[PDB]
Amino acid sequence: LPTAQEVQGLMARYIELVDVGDIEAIVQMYADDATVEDPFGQPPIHGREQIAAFYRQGLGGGKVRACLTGPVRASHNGCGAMPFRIEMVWNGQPCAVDVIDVMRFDEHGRIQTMQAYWSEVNLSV
């Protein structure tokens, strides 16, 4: 189980990978039986191929940017939460979404569960 400091690192690393848009690197951060709920409230997606397809859909557009908007909050049980902003292009319009990701890591330092909190109230132009 990642220490709190290690959770901070992994979670910041995740945002960095999203920001440069390395899909393969993002998918490698996940455990084989990981789940992704994004946005939280929608049914979880499971399976490495499914998670790759998710990130391909989301980031494969090319110009998606992401950055922490505050420090990573980390627990002593391998979990953490972080606020960030995603910038992307919607219908040729620049737009942004404010998100919080909650993650649990497994004993191998891999993401076991990802929950992304956001909705239309968090979307702007």
- Of 14, 19, 32, 98, the active-site residue reads 14
88-93-97 Cα angle (round to 5):
40
- Of 30, 32, 38, 106, the active-site residue reads 38
Helix (H, G, I), strand (E, B) or coil at 114: strand
Establish whether 14 is a catalytic residue. yes
22 labelled binding-site residue = no
Establish whether 38 is a catalytic residue. yes
Question: How far is residue 16 from each of residues 7, 9, 47, 125, measured CA to CA in Å?
Answer: 14, 10, 23, 23
Binding site, by residue number, is 101
Residue positions annotated with a catalytic role: 14, 38
